[PDB]
Amino acid sequence: DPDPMKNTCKLLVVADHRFYRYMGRGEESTTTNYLIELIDRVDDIYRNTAWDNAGFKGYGIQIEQIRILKSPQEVKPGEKHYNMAKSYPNEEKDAWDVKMLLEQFSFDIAEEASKVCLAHLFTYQDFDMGTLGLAYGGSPRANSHGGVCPKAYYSPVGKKNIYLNSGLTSTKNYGKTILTKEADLVTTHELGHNFGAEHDPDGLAECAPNEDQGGKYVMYPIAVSGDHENNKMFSQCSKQSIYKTIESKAQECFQERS
């Protein structure tokens, strides 16, 4: 019998009412299929990366559970929820303030997020300044305040434990639905932050090549289009950061590939 390999970060995937209506065409099957195919293509990127440029490969992601929120969350006055009909803090805007939305999703999904490596929200809202997603950055440290593997942080206001093993992806930008190849890269980038990578800096040519050299890698701070070969790959900078996080945290919460 082969030795067990805890090499898979299991995900709770949530599609809010906005995603369900505008991406899933108001259908469970259409919503599910989009998310399953997207996670699998993102998994091909992770699972195939040799994090240490040798044998530290086969580390990826798998959906553990899909939660579909078919309707907006009914809220009482002064109450907020990441799945409510209105955007917060400004109801006049198409989208929430992205940082407040991530905080709100982490607060509301807490009980479910405590049981998975990562929780990821899929929404359909046009965040300001070309923002397509947000995630808490991971690290090898036990008290990382985010990323892979749930760690309880108590909320005195909520009187409960909250977890920062979260991220979100929007498939809406500049009033339109983004291409699927763009959506795959956003989730890759967000999970990249969760797995411990920071943005690729301009100061290290190796991690930020010119367009004639295959373009930028996935963790570049200006969102890659997917048009260039490097777009769907992690730079050597991301590989070193992620390798250190995985090495420390796979034994904590990664599981066998299902």
- Cβ distance 119 to 113 under 8 Å? yes
DSSP state of 255: B
Length of the chain as a residue count: 258
- Cβ distance 12 to 119 under 8 Å? yes
ω into 89 cis (within 30 of 0): yes
Cα–Cα distance for residue pair 101/81, rounded to 1 Å: 9
Binding mask 103-142 for ligand Z93 (x = CB under 6 A): ----------------------------xxxxx-------
**Closer residue to ligand Z93 in complex, CB, 62/131:** 131
**Closer residue to ligand Z93 in complex, CB, 16/190:** 190
Is there a binding annotation on residue 81? no
Is there a binding annotation on residue 199? yes
**Closer residue to ligand Z93 in complex, CB, 113/197:** 197
Show the CA angle centred on residue 139, arms to residues 120 and 97, nearest 5°: 45
- Which residues does residue 161 pair with via DSSP β-bridges, in sequence order? 154
Is there a binding annotation on residue 193? yes
First and final C-alpha spacing in the chain: 16
Residue nearest to ligand Z93 (CB): 223
**Minimum Å distance from CB 121 to ligand Z93?**
13
38 φ, ψ (degrees, to nearest 5):
-65, -50
**Minimum Å distance from CB 133 to ligand Z93?**
5
> Taking contact as CB under 6 A, which single stretch among the options 57-65, 156-164, 189-197, 208-216 is the one that binds ligand Z93?
189-197
**Closer residue to ligand Z93 in complex, CB, 8/171:** 171
Is residue 95 a contact point for ligand Z93 (CB under 6 A)? no
- Based on the residue annotation, tell me whether 92 is a catalytic residue of this protein: no
Is residue 164 a contact point for ligand Z93 (CB under 6 A)? no
The set of residues, in sequence order, having a beta carbon less than 8 Å from that of 73 and lying 6+ positions away, is: 17, 81, 82, 83, 84, 85
DSSP state of 24: S
Which member of 28, 103, 190, 247 is catalytic? Answer: 190
- Cβ distance 199 to 144 under 8 Å? no
**Minimum Å distance from CB 154 to ligand Z93?**
23
Is residue 193 a contact point for ligand Z93 (CB under 6 A)? yes
Query: Which residues lie near ligand Z93 (CB under 6 A)?
Result: 98-99, 131-135, 185-186, 189-190, 193, 221, 223-224
Give catalytic residue positions. Answer: 190
